[PDB]
Amino acid sequence: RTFTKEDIRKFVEEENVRYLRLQFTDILGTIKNVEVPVSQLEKVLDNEMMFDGSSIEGFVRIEESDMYLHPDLDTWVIFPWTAGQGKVARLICDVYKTDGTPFEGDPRANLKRVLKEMEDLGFTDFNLGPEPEFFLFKLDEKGEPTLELNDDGGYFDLAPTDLGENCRRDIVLELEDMGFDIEASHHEVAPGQHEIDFKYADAVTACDNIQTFKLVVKTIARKHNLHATFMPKPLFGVNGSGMHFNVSLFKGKENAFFDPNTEMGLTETAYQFTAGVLKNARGFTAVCNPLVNSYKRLVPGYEAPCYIAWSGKNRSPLIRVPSSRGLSTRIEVRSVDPAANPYMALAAILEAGLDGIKNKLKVPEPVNQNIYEMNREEREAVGIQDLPSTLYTALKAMRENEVIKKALGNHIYNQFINSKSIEWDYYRTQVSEWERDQYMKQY
Amino acid sequence: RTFTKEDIRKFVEEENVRYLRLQFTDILGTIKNVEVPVSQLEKVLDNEMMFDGSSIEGFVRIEESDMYLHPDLDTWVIFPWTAGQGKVARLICDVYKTDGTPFEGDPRANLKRVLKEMEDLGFTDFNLGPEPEFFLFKLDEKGEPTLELNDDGGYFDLAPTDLGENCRRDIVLELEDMGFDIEASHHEVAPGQHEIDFKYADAVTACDNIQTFKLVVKTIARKHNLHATFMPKPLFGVNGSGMHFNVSLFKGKENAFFDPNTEMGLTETAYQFTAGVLKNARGFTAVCNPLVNSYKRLVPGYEAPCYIAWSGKNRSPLIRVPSSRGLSTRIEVRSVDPAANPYMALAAILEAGLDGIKNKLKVPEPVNQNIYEMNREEREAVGIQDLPSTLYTALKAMRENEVIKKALGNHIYNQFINSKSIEWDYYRTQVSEWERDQYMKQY
Numbered sequence: 001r002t003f004t005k006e007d008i009r010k011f012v013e014e015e016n017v018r019y020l021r022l023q024f025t026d027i028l029g030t031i032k033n034v035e036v037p038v039s040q041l042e043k044v045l046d047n048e049m050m051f052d053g054s055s056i057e058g059f060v061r062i063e064e065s066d067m068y069l070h071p072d073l074d075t076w077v078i079f080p081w082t083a084g085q086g087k088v089a090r091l092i093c094d095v096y097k098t099d100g101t102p103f104e105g106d107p108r109a110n111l112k113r114v115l116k117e118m119e120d121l122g123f124t125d126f127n128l129g130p131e132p133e134f135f136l137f138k139l140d141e142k143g144e145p146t147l148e149l150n151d152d153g154g155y156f157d158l159a160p161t162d163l164g165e166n167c168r169r170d171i172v173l174e175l176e177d178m179g180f181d182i183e184a185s186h187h188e189v190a191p192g193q194h195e196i197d198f199k200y201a202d203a204v205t206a207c208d209n210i211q212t213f214k215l216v217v218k219t220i221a222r223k224h225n226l227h228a229t230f231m232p233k234p235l236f237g238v239n240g241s242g243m244h245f246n247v248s249l250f251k252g253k254e255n256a257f258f259d260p261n262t263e264m265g266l267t268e269t270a271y272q273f274t275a276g277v278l279k280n281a282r283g284f285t286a287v288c289n290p291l292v293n294s295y296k297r298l299v300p301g302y303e304a305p306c307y308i309a310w311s312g313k314n315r316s317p318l319i320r321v322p323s324s325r326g327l328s329t330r331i332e333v334r335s336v337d338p339a340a341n342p343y344m345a346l347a348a349i350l351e352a353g354l355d356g357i358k359n360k361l362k363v364p365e366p367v368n369q370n371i372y373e374m375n376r377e378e379r380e381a382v383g384i385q386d387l388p389s390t391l392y393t394a395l396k397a398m399r400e401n402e403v404i405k406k407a408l409g410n411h412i413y414n415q416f417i418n419s420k421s422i423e424w425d426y427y428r429t430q431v432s433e434w435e436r437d438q439y440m441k442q443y
Numbered sequence: 444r445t446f447t448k449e450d451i452r453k454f455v456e457e458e459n460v461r462y463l464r465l466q467f468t469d470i471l472g473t474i475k476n477v478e479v480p481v482s483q484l485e486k487v488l489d490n491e492m493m494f495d496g497s498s499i500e501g502f503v504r505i506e507e508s509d510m511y512l513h514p515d516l517d518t519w520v521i522f523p524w525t526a527g528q529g530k531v532a533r534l535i536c537d538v539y540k541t542d543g544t545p546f547e548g549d550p551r552a553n554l555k556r557v558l559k560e561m562e563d564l565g566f567t568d569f570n571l572g573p574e575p576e577f578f579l580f581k582l583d584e585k586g587e588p589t590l591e592l593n594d595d596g597g598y599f600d601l602a603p604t605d606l607g608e609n610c611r612r613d614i615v616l617e618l619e620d621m622g623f624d625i626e627a628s629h630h631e632v633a634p635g636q637h638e639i640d641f642k643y644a645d646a647v648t649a650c651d652n653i654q655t656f657k658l659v660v661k662t663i664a665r666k667h668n669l670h671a672t673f674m675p676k677p678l679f680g681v682n683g684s685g686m687h688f689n690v691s692l693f694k695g696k697e698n699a700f701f702d703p704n705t706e707m708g709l710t711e712t713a714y715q716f717t718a719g720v721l722k723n724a725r726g727f728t729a730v731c732n733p734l735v736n737s738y739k740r741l742v743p744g745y746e747a748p749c750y751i752a753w754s755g756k757n758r759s760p761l762i763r764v765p766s767s768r769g770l771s772t773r774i775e776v777r778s779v780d781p782a783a784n785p786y787m788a789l790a791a792i793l794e795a796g797l798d799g800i801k802n803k804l805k806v807p808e809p810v811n812q813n814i815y816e817m818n819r820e821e822r823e824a825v826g827i828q829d830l831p832s833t834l835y836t837a838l839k840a841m842r843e844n845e846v847i848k849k850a851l852g853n854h855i856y857n858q859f860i861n862s863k864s865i866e867w868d869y870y871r872t873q874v875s876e877w878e879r880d881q882y883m884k885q886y
């Protein structure tokens with residue numbers, strides 16, 4: 001069910017592939033890659049491809065720059081928009097040190113580490129169905145983006161109110177040709193916003209999917225004279241974009257979250273799992289919402305969470321339980337946004353979830369109600385805690401949580417905190433057009 | 444005949460449609476749809492598939508916000524401007540709740556509910572032939588509509604006075620290749636105004652016929668560098684657009700409105716029905732004219748109604764009985780405008796008419812003169828009421844009518860009152876440039 005070096009060797013000759021892209025993911029969720037001519041295949045498969053690690057965000061220092069790429073052969077895919085003499089294929093890679101030690105800073109591998117912990121606890125797969133929503137801006141004279149959305153449409157609109165109809169069709173086409181099992185395509189709430197959904201996959205595969213997804217969304221958009229962006233809240237007073245993380249544990253072909261006995265079809269594994277996410281949600285939101293701009297979307301009134309609670313069929317809370325049951329039984333962690341590093345965010349959610357199982361915690365009361373229309377002490381009554389309000393308050397929540405530190409390991413944890421703290425302090429000393437428009441004449 | 448799943452399956456295979464487009468309508472009459480690839484065909488046909496009802500206007504709240512779609516299979520249609528590999532079929536859907544119940548808030552479901560009460564009183568089909576007039580404006584360079592109209596032509600004008608022949612011929616062509624029975628196209632009275640008529644059909648498919656028609660006109664208008672608008676009165680001083688509702692009852696392929704033996708040629712069933720339409724007109728005007736702007740159409744001098752009355756061959760009253768008889772025999776409610784939600788409006792007029800049959804009401808006598816040149820005191824004489832003049836009074840007339848509260852059921856009634864009252868209380872507060880032009884120098 002895994003591919004061998006000779007599997008890959010045959011694909012390269014069958015489809016007459018000309019170039020290889022070796023791709024991997026830094027600490028910011030940003031995909032990086034070098035292209036080699038397929039004449040270098042044997043170097044690729046014997047794990048002898050090198051790059052400057054010091055030139056990558058959350059990696060090594062300049063005095064130990066050299067690092068290697070190790071291709072995960074299962075990640076093979078060919079880019080259905082490439083020619084015959086320019087056919088390009090891809091391998092996603094894990095990062096290693098010169099000595100053959102896998103890198104403590106690799107985000108993909110760190111998720112592979114946390115998934116071995118769920119396995120020793122008796123679960124065969126951790127499935128994630130991501131929901132990355134995006135905005136489409138128009139490009140100008142000289143190719144750079146503008147602030148003019150591509151339409152003034154809204155949820156489930158059709159053409160011409162929704163003008164990214166063709167562009168979404170082109171993204172489904174190339175994606176389907178890449179082995180994506182697409183599920184739905186539609187205009188989202190906010191003007192210019194779009195959603196394309198695809199079937200869930202096992203943890204490592206799902207993240208690889210997100211990275212591919214972004215990759216295809218952005219380039220096809222450019223071919224439609226549009227600029228795509230996964231920024232959390234591009235604009236005040238409209239819905240932001242969130243990368244909902246639908247998750248579930250399988251004991252093999254069977255969904256450990258589903259109960260065919262009860263009226264709400266949830267097992268107590270699932271209740272325990274949701275318990276852990278809720279307990280540790282403060283500690284992991286810096287990682288699921290790692291930009292300053294991520295907290296301009298965690299504001300009430302736009303179907304994004306602000307308050308740690310769970311409920312079914314309810315889109316105001318941090319955890320919605322969608323109505324589907326059966327193999328589709330899942331918890332939806334709505335706080336995640338598309339700027340998150342998927343590998344790290346899923347590591348976060350998984351180990352928080354595994355915290356609830358290993359510690360057999362009982363879940364709080366479902367908040368079956370519109371949490372926005374609740375006031376500070378009406379929710380303080382039922383024990384509903386807030387998520388961090390700023391990126392600075394999110395990191396502090398991180399420094400004091402013990403689970404996110406285990407889910408990330410010491411390197412990523414420190415490199416993440418060190419970067420984002422510098423990030424905050426550049427922001428914190430910016431003077432906004434807001435401050436000037438409100439304060440330059442008045443005072 | 445009536446299509447069944449495997450009928451659906453075979454058409455999908457035999458035609459290689461790659462994409463389903465599932466559509467439903469919100470309270471404001473606006474079409475809503477999601478694209479899903481044919482991968483998901485079986486998830487569609489098992490009514491297994493969902494959307495967010497709190498982001499549909501006039502539907503559910505965010506706490507209870509998960510809803511499903513049941514496709515009406517008889518609505519299968521392949522878009523004749525989608526080639527292979529990008530070929531889209533459509534299915535109109537009904538809307539269901541998480542408990543498997545139809546949604547009280549579905550406007551289409553509702554028309555179906557009322558049509559059931561029509562089968563009670565012994566009628567097989569309620570046919571409607573709609574007449575959705577529209578305007579075409581010129582786009583500017585960056586794609587947005589301007590206030591320059593496409594021609595300056597009149598009723599029945601030719602090219603080059605009429606510069607919409609070519610936009611209309613393309614509309615007519617796509618429409619026939621979607622199965623429409625087109626009956627005429629021509630320039631309408633106002634400059635830039637156009638009409639395309641088509642055969643009547645049963646109530647549901649006719650409202651479906653209107654939604655498709657609207658979507659196909661706006662699409663093709665863009666292809667021609669135009670903006671189609673179904674706004675009732677886009678410009679002062681020249682006719683508005685109406686959506687004439689031509690209706691009749693059938694006792695099984697027999698025009699129940701046609702009496703072959705009498706001179707006028709109407710059965711007493713047709714008379715009773717008009718009595719009910721005429722009695723309840725004020726109560727259903729808000730739903731037939733839901734815009735502030737709807738009421739700048741409903742003003743004398745423009746071939747559009749403003750007084751509750753009925754006449755044959757006569758184009759001033761609310762209701763006109765056109766000369767044609769036989770199976771063409773119909774009443775024409777001329778108040779309807781194209782911003783009206785088709786399903787709701789038809790539900791409203793269907794029950795008003797039913798109100799008159801069941802109670803065997805008797806018809807006001809016809810007003811066989813140009814009822815725009817009758818003085819308020821001359822009209823009060825014969826006992827002729829006025830239509831509501833503002834959306835606010837129309838809402839007042841609606842809150843005080845019992846037939847309309849039962850045509851919509853409480854959810855649609857309540858949702859529409861609420862939404863439109865708010866739409867008014869913004870309008871009533873804005874300062875018109877009319878006001879600043881007459882008053883700002885004089886005072």
Ligand SMILES: Nc1ncnc2c1ncn2[C@@H]1O[C@H](COP(=O)(O)OP(=O)(O)O)[C@@H](O)[C@H]1O
Binds near residue numbers: 198199201247
């Ligand atoms: N058992 C499961 N575990 C994790 N994700 C799942 C499971 N079943 C379905 N999903 C995922 O949840 C996603 C949610 O799809 P979507 O239609 O976007 O739901 P909504 O938009 O209503 O939250 C799908 O992408 C699917 O792959």
Ligand SMILES: Nc1ncnc2c1ncn2[C@@H]1O[C@H](COP(=O)(O)OP(=O)(O)O)[C@@H](O)[C@H]1O
Binds near residue numbers: 626691
């Ligand atoms: N029995 C009927 N019931 C409802 N509509 C009908 C019937 N017979 C004809 N019609 C419809 O009336 C419409 C005529 O519109 P049109 O020719 O524009 O009339 P007008 O003379 O009012 O412009 C068509 O949509 C046609 O299908």
Ligand SMILES: C[S@](=O)(CC[C@H](N)C(=O)O)=NP(=O)(O)O
Binds near residue numbers: 131494495
């Ligand atoms: C209507 S929405 O509910 C959009 C939510 C918002 N944009 C956010 O996640 O921040 N999401 P979904 O795809 O789950 O229906």
Ligand SMILES: C[S@](=O)(CC[C@H](N)C(=O)O)=NP(=O)(O)O
Binds near residue numbers: 576684686745746758
């Ligand atoms: C000549 S007109 O009579 C124009 C009516 C106008 N546009 C309105 O109903 O507002 N309508 P029709 O197509 O029924 O002849």
Ligand SMILES: [Mg+2]
Binds near residue numbers: 046048
């Ligand atoms: Mg070697």
Ligand SMILES: [Mg+2]
Binds near residue numbers: 080081177
């Ligand atoms: Mg291709």
Ligand SMILES: [Mg+2]
Binds near residue numbers: 131195197
């Ligand atoms: Mg979704």
Ligand SMILES: [Mg+2]
Binds near residue numbers: 131133188195
């Ligand atoms: Mg969404």
Ligand SMILES: [Mg+2]
Binds near residue numbers: 131244332
């Ligand atoms: Mg979601």
Ligand SMILES: [Mg+2]
Binds near residue numbers: 491
């Ligand atoms: Mg199923």
Ligand SMILES: [Mg+2]
Binds near residue numbers: 638640
């Ligand atoms: Mg006509």
Ligand SMILES: [Mg+2]
Binds near residue numbers: 574576631638
């Ligand atoms: Mg007309």
Ligand SMILES: [Mg+2]
Binds near residue numbers: 574687775
């Ligand atoms: Mg007419």
Ligand SMILES: [Mg+2]
Binds near residue numbers: 702705710711
């Ligand atoms: Mg008789």
